[PDB]
Each structure stands twice: as structure tokens, then as C-alpha cells.
Ligand binder design. Sequence first.
Ligand SMILES: O=c1[nH]c(=O)c2ncn([C@@H]3O[C@H](CO)[C@@H](O)[C@H]3O)c2[nH]1
Length: 244
Amino acid sequence: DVSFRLSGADPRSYGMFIKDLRNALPFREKVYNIPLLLPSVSGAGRYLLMHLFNYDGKTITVAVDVTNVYIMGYLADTTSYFFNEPAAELASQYVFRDARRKITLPYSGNYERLQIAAGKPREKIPIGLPALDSAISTLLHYDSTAAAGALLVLIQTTAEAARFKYIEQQIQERAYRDEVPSLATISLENSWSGLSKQIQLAQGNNGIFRTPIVLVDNKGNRVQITNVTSKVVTSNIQLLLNTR
Ligand SMILES: O=c1[nH]c(=O)c2ncn([C@@H]3O[C@H](CO)[C@@H](O)[C@H]3O)c2[nH]1
């Protein structure tokens, strides 16, 4: 398992949590020095448990699919909660079985669906460590509207930070003051599957992307990613979604 305590959290302890989270995701090989997530894992081993604690020490446990860093659901006190999608019902077979009742949220984990349920897009929801404090508090007691926004914060401050060093650094900047994600943050979240695909394909194409990827850079400017010498590949992306 991995844990993160917001009580006494600083940029250093958040960075240690994101390091713990990346290290709990298995890999057999690296492609261009980036861990390649497994095509599949059978049984309960597919799901990593993250123990998150708000400033007041109240906690949820979050289930993460280790093949794709997708959050499936979470445990709050004696109630489990899962997204309304087949991958999450499958996860409910292995995690939080001991919960008194299992609620299926009235949405899938898709960003588009969560934003409709929350009533705001990601671009207008402040993220940071205070926002994660608020998200954990929201999730402790069922409220499906409130939970959709809390889940957008949770996804970005855990899974997306694991996937991209730049997003980890953006949340560190927001240790004590929330701020809507940067344009590069949204760009990277949107592009992880594409980048993962082009980096795997670049093996057999001399490190050249078969299809270049349009991103927004750290200064808010367009950058076209054509090959593995790009700083997005050499410094930023930390995990690859297996092309399978
Ligand atoms: O639960 C989630 N964890 C994630 O890391 C994550 N990243 C993206 N999503 C969104 O969920 C959809 C899959 O059902 C994707 O299309 C993303 O929008 C995520 N959902």
C-alpha cells in the first residue's frame, strides 16, 4: 500500500508520496528509460490501495488499477464507492469486500462525465494540497455532485502527478494555495495515452513519432513533439500505458 498525510504535508512529503505511488506500479521493462506498465495483472494484485488522510486525520482508501493508474473506487468508513463502468465493477470483486454496503456512483470515471456531474470543467476547478484535503473530506460522506469535483481533484493530485513530473511539481507549487491547473497540466493529462503510444512506436522508427503530438509547454506555448529527445520524453513522463 502507499499513504499520504495532509497534516504536516510539505512539498517534500508530497513528493515522497508520488515516488511511493510510482514505485508500487509493477514493470518488467523500461522503454527509453521510462517504466512500461504491465499489459494485465490477474486477481487482487491488479489494485494498489492508497491511504489518504485529511488535515484532521480522517481517511479514505483509494483503489488504483496498476496497469493504467485508473482510480476504480474508494472506501470511506464502512461504505465502498465504485465508478459506474465495467472495470470498476470488476475491481469491486477484489477490494473493500468487507464494507457494509457498496454504492455505485452515478457516473463513470471519464473526465468528460465527471465534469458534467461536477457542473464545471477541470480548467475551472482549483487543485493543490488544500483542495486534496477538501476532496478527502467531501468523499467521507456520500454526495454524488460534490464527489464528482472531489474525484477530479483526487485524480489530478495522485494519478496524473504519478504520470508526469511536471504535474507533480505543479501540485508542489500549490502546497498551501490552490490554483486551476496550468494549460500544460490539462494538455499532458489529455495526451498520456498518445505519448505512451508514440514512445513505444518510436522503438522501430529510430526514436521518431509515427504521429507527432501537439502539447502546451510550461510557458503556455504550443510545442509539437516529434521524437524521444523531447524533454517531455527525457524528463517529464514517468510511466507508459502499455500499447496492449
Ligand atoms: O479514475 C480515473 N483515474 C485516472 O487516472 C484518469 N485519467 C483519466 N481518467 C479519465 O477516465 C476516463 C476513462 O473512463 C478517461 O477518458 C479519462 O477521461 C481517469 N479516471
